Amino acid sequence: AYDMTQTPASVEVAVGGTVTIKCQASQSISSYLSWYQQKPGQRPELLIYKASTLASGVSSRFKGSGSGTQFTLTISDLEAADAATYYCQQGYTSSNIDNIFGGGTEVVVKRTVAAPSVFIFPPSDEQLKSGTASVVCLLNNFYPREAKVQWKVDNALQSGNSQESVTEQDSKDSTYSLSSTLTLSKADYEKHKVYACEVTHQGLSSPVTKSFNRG
Amino acid sequence: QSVEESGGRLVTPGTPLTLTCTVSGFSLSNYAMIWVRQAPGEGLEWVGTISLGGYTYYANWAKGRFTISKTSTTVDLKISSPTTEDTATYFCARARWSTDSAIYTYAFDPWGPGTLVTVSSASTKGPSVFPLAPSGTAALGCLVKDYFPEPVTVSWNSGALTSGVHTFPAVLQSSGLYSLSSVVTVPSSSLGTQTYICNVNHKPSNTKVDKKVEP
Amino acid sequence: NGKLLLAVFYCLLFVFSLLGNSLVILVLVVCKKLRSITDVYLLNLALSDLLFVFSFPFQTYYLLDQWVFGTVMCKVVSGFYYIGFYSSMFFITLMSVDRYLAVVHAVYALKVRTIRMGTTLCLAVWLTAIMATIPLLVFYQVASEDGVLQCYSFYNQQTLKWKIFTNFKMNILGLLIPFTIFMFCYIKILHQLKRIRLVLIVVIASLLFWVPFNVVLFLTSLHSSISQQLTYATHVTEIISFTHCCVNPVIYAFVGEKFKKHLSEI
């Protein structure tokens, strides 16, 4: 019945800027919208209720407006700690409802471009004894999130045997970290000599390679 | 005011489950209680609501599979027959404004620390810890591998070291078992003087590991 | 701090109204067998006033602290209030019609004035009042305004039409038709008699008690800064109206000689 849609899926904004998030209902609700914020790995917190009134303890930089169908939330002076996900919730009715919450909008704080730092970790002796080899390469403290990594064994490309993990945006520095792990069979480890992780990111003029030879 | 969730467990697909939400600081006769669920890396999903008088309202998809009850101090949510798609973090919230028929039930505050529920036929397993030893600054870490289910907590020097510690989210492998890495960057000169120990803790299997990394 | 004073006033009204209605019912049921038709309507009017009397303690405990009785009681207390209002308003019309029928149509009066007619009309009036009250109750319920409970009626923008419908229903059904019947009957009765005062005083009192309430409700319906004084007006008019149940026994004990004959003895 009442379907809540949040227009911008993700918005990128510099510090000291204005952020506008729009929420919409399929049917009119007489100004009964609430806004919640969820920082990564934390419980949600209330910001505004009745679409205009601030919850006690929340700063005055958040301003909610709108009534009827359209609704808006504005963040006036953005800070590095404002990177989170915002949800609009309709408190009109609870009968024949699929979901009272919206899709959620993510705010990513803009920052000066910073090249990653690259480290390479070869498999340890214990794991090699166990029967599996893991080679890890780490990209640290970079922005933006669009970094790319390629593995090369004896100058030959590999695919389908590498997995990447990325952290959430830092609340203090607004940077990112990524880690790529390549898993090989114990026997296959000695079939080759040189391993390399190559990184492409906007902060580097040319791709940067970190490599090691068994020994 | 505080709400605490309990009952998170690894349950085989088909056996009923029950979660509890204990309350402190306020009376349940005055407020309504909301149950929400969030899949890993997805938006909030309202499941059900219990009002002042004890009238339960469920989302369309949740009708017939969940049941909410209340008592003097605790609120229980029972899952009659969980399926593999029921794995998620369950939150318990208090509605500050509410009506006995669940209209005008907007402001939710405070929230609780969600409880994680996993459904699968795979048995629990203990993590395997390996050291990613070092080769300006240096990076070193501990690789936790092939554990199940979530979560695993990794700290450094029993919590003494916290600056520059990155713990990436767990990634589900092809074998159905998770993997994770924890990396810390430190001054190079400190490598030969101080000792770094990764403390891995896995509650489901009651596993404690203290692995030291040395070049 | 006006809520405490209002609660004390409600307690005063409770005690006096309960005593008066109890005395009236006591005399009518002990020292008479309700042989006269006139006594049956008085008995029903007293039983209607007791319905108001029974809703005071909940209101007193609501002014102090808050509403802790739930939703079923939230509906039932309002049902008592509205049923009492409607029934007491209709029984006065029945009394006025009966008095007209006697004074003017005395020749034909002997056939109608029997116990069976009184019983049937009283049952019909009670059912009519209950049916007219049914629409209002469906919307009353308990709400939490940040932990504070309150019993009140809530309408969505879809069901809002029923609020206007019920307001106008109350107005026309409970004021205009009874007032028209009084106007028709008592001009003729005075025309015949000037050349009794009891029922005339009863109607004028019970109309002046409720007319401010009806007027403020009419203004509220038309409206749907004026809000604040309109709220004050309706709040005061509620108390103004409440006194009819207390004063009806006063009138019947002051005027009727039959009441005195058995009240002096006790």
CATH of the domain at C38: 1.20.1070.10
**Which of A2, A53, A87, A119 to mutate to probe the B interface, most B CBs <10 Å?**
A119
Helix (H) or strand (E) segment spanning residue B134: none
Establish, for the pair of chains B and C, how many residue pairs have beta carbons separated by less than 8 Å. 40
Say whether B177 sits in a helix, a strand or coil. coil
| Neighbour-count burial of A150, counting CB atoms closer than 10 A to its CB (0-12 exposed, 13-18 middle, 19+ buried) | middle
| Nearest Cα to Cα of residue B68 among B40, B47, B90 | B47
Q: Nearest by CB to C71, from B29, B30, B100: name it.
A: B100
Angstroms from B172 CA to nearest CA on chain A? 10
Number of domain units in chain C: 1
CB < 8 Å to C68, chain B: 29
| CB burial of residue A164 (10 Å; 0-12, 13-18, 19+) | middle
CA count, 13 A, side-chain hemisphere, C35: 5
User: What are the distances in angstroms from CA C52 to CA B119, C16, C55, C124?
Assistant: 59, 12, 5, 20
The three-point CA angle B165-A158-A198 to 5° equals 50
- CA-nearest of B200, B32, B36 to B117 is B36
Q: How far is B49 from chain C (nearest CA, A)?
A: 15
Structure tokens at C231: 């709220």
Chains with 3 or more CB pairs under 8 A to chain B: A, C
Cβ–Cβ contacts within 10 Å for residue C134, how many?
12
Q: How far is CA C194 from the centre of its chain?
A: 30
Does the beta-carbon distance from B52 to C149 stay under 8 Å?
A: yes
Task: Give strand pairing partners of C143.
Answer: B99, C150
Residues C29, A90: Cα–Cα separation, whole Å: 59
The residue of chain B with its CA nearest to that of C156 is: B103
Structure-block tokens of residue B166: 């990155």
Bridge-based pairing state of the strands A85-90 and A33-38: antiparallel
Q: Is C36's Cβ below 8 Å from some Cβ in B?
A: no
Nearest CA-CA partner of A12 in A82, A64, A63, A115: A82
Backbone angles phi and psi of C81, in degrees to 5: -55, -50
Q: What is the CATH number of domain A4-109?
A: 2.60.40.10
Query: B136 near B191, Cβ under 8 Å?
Result: no
Distances (CA, A) of C63 to A166, C17, C60, C133: 59, 20, 5, 24
Distance in angstroms (rounded) separating the CA atoms of residues B38 and B113: 12
Q: Is residue A69 within 8 angstroms of chain C, CB to CB? A: no
Distance from CA of A43 to the nearest CA of C (A): 21
State the number of CA atoms in the 13 A half-sphere of B61 facing the CB: 9
Q: Are A86 and A104 in contact (CB under 8 A)?
A: yes
Q: What is the resolution of this structure in A?
A: 2.9
What sign does the dihedral B91-B96-B102-B103 (CA atoms) show? negative
Selection from C141, C164, C180 nearest residue C220 by Cα? C164
Query: Residue C51: which of C18, C84, C88 has the closest Cα?
Result: C84
Is C157 in the A-facing interface, judged by CB distances under 8 Å?
A: yes
Residues B47, B58 contacting (CB under 8 angstroms): yes
Q: State the maximum Cα–Cα separation within chain B, in Å, rounded to a whole number.
A: 67
Q: Does C154 touch chain B (CB under 8 A)?
A: yes
C149–chain B Cβ distance below 8 A for any pair = yes
Question: Cα(B56)–Cα(A47) distance, rounded to whole angstroms?
Answer: 26
**Chain B residue numbers touching C154 (CB-CB < 8 A):** 99, 103-104
Cα-flanking dihedrals φ and ψ of residue B55, to 5°?
-105, 125
Contacts of C165 (CB under 8 A, 6+ apart): C135
- Compute how many other C-beta atoms are within 10 angstroms of the C-beta atom of residue C8: 12
Q: Which two tokens stand for residue C128?
A: 């009519």
Answer yes or no: are the C-beta atoms of A42 and A89 closer than 8 Å.
no
Q: Nearest CB to B101: which of C68, C141, C149?
A: C141
Report how this structure was experimentally obtained.
cryo-EM
How close B143 gets to chain A, by Cα (Å)?
9
The answer to whether the A4-109 and A117-213 domains have the same CATH topology is yes
d(CA C144, CA C58): 18
Shortest alpha-carbon distance between residue C154 and chain B (Å): 9
Q: Are B165 and A170 in contact (CB under 8 A)?
A: no
HSE-CB for C79 with a 13 A CA cutoff: 15
- Kindly list the distances between the CA atom of residue A22 and the CA atoms of A127, B44, C24, C64, in Å, as whole numbers in the listed order: 51, 18, 67, 43
d(CA C67, CA C61): 7
Q: What b-and-e string marks burial along C34-72, b requiring 16 or more CB atoms within 10 Å of the CB?
A: eeebbbbbbbbbbbbbbbbbbbbebbbebeeebbeebbe
Whether chain A has a CB inside 8 Å of the CB on C229: the answer is: no
Fold match between B2-119 and B128-213? yes
Q: How far apart are CA A152 and CA B196, in angstroms?
A: 31
Measured in degrees and rounded to the nearest 5, phi and psi for residue C232 equal -60, -40
Residue ranges of the domains in chain A?
4-109, 117-213
What is the Cα–Cα distance from A178 to C202, expressed in whole angstroms?
Answer: 88
Extract the tokens encoding C131: 């049916």
User: How many C-alpha atoms does A156 have within 13 Å on its Cβ side?
Assistant: 6
- Distance of alpha carbon A88 from alpha carbon A66, whole angstroms: 12
d(CA A170, CA A96): 40
Residues of C with Cβ-Cβ distance to B94 under 8 angstroms: none
Q: Are the C-beta atoms of residues C134 and C141 closer than 8 Å to each other?
A: no
Distance between CA atoms of residues C188 and C100, nearest Å: 8
Residue A139 CB coordination number (10 Å): 24
3-state SS string over chain C?
CHHHHHHHHHHHHHHHHHHHHHHHHHHHHHCCCCCCHHHHHHHHHHHHHHHHHHHHHHHHHHHCCCCCCHHHHHHHHHHHHHHHHHHHHHHHHHHHHHHHHHHHCHHHHHHHCCHHHHHHHHHHHHHHHHHHHHHHHCCEEEEEECCCEEEEECCCCCCHHHHHHHHHHHHHHHHHHHHHHHHHHHHHHHHHHCCCHHHHHHHHHHHHHHHHHHHHHHHHHHHCCHHHHHHHHHHHHHHHHHHHHHHHHHHHHHHCHHHHHHHCCC
DSSP B50-82: E-SS--EEE-TTTTTTEEEEE-SSEEEEEESS-
Judged by DSSP in three states, B49 sits in: strand
B135 DSSP assignment: -
Domain region containing C94: 2-263
> Strand B10-11 vs strand B115-119: parallel, antiparallel, or unpaired?
parallel
Nearest-angstrom CA–CA distance, A93 and C156: 9
C156 at A interface, C-beta within 8 A: yes
HEC string for B90-128: EEEEEECEEECCCCCCCCECCCCCCEEEEECCCCCECCE
Kindly report the nearest CA distance between residue B28 and chain C, in angstroms. 10
Enter the CATH code of domain A117-213.
Answer: 2.60.40.10
CA distance B40 to A139: 24
What is residue B206's three-state secondary structure?
coil
CA atoms within 13 A on the CB side of C120: 6
Q: Are B99 and C149 a contacting pair at CB < 8 A?
A: no
Which chains would you list as touching C if contact means 3+ CB atom pairs under 8 Å?
A, B
Burial of C144 (0-12, 13-18, 19+ CB in 10 A): buried
In the three-class reduction of DSSP (H, G, I as helix; E, B as strand; rest coil), residue B13 is classed as: coil
Task: Give residue B68's Cα distance to chain centre.
Answer: 21
Angle (deg, nearest 10), helices C197-223 and C160-171: 160
Distance CA A79, CA A83 (A): 8
Question: Residue C3: is it exposed, middle or buried by C-beta count within 10 angstroms (0-12/13-18/19+)?
Answer: exposed
CA B37 – CA B87 distance, rounded (Å): 9
* Structural domain boundaries in chain B: 2-119, 128-213
CATH topology for B2-119?
Answer: Immunoglobulin-like (2.60.40)
Residues of B with CB under 8 A from a CB of C: 26, 29-32, 52-53, 95-101, 103-104, 107
Q: With H, G, I as helix, E, B as strand and everything else as coil, classify residue B1.
A: coil
DSSP state of B87: -
Please give the structure tokens belonging to residue C88. 């007491």
Instruction: List CB contacts (< 8 A) between C156 and chain A.
Output: 93
- Chain A residues 96-155 with CB within 8 Å of chain C: none
Asked if the Cβ–Cβ distance from A44 to B105 is below 8 Å, we say: no
- Distance CA(C127)–CA(C138), nearest Å, equals 17
Token pair for C66 = 């808050």
β pairing state of A68-75 and B56-58: unpaired
d(CA C152, CA C141): 6
In chain C, residues with a C-beta closer than 8 Å to the C-beta of A30 are 157
Contact A113, A174 (CB under 8 A): no
Specify the DSSP class assigned to residue B8: -
Which CATH superfamily hosts domain B128-213? Immunoglobulins (2.60.40.10)
Q: b/e string for B29-56 if b means 16 or more Cβ within 10 A?
A: ebbbbbbbbbeeeebbbbbbbbbbbeee
Distance CA B105, CA A94 (A): 8
Contacts of B128 in chain A (CB under 8 A): 130
Looking at residue B161, the DSSP 8-state letter turns out to be B
Written in H, E and C, the secondary structure of chain A is CCCEEECCCEEEECCCCCEEEEEEEEEEECCCEEEEEECCCCCCEEEEECCCEECCCCCCCEEEECCEEEEEEEECCCCHHHCCEEEEEECCCCCCCCCCECCCEEEEECCCCECCEEEEECCCHHHHHHCEEEEEEEEEEEECCCCEEEEEECCEECCCCEEEEECCCCCCCCCEEEEEEEEEEHHHHHCCCEEEEEEECCCCCCCEEEEEECC
Buried/exposed code over B186-201 (b: 16+ C-beta within 10 A; e: otherwise): beeeebeeeebbbbbe
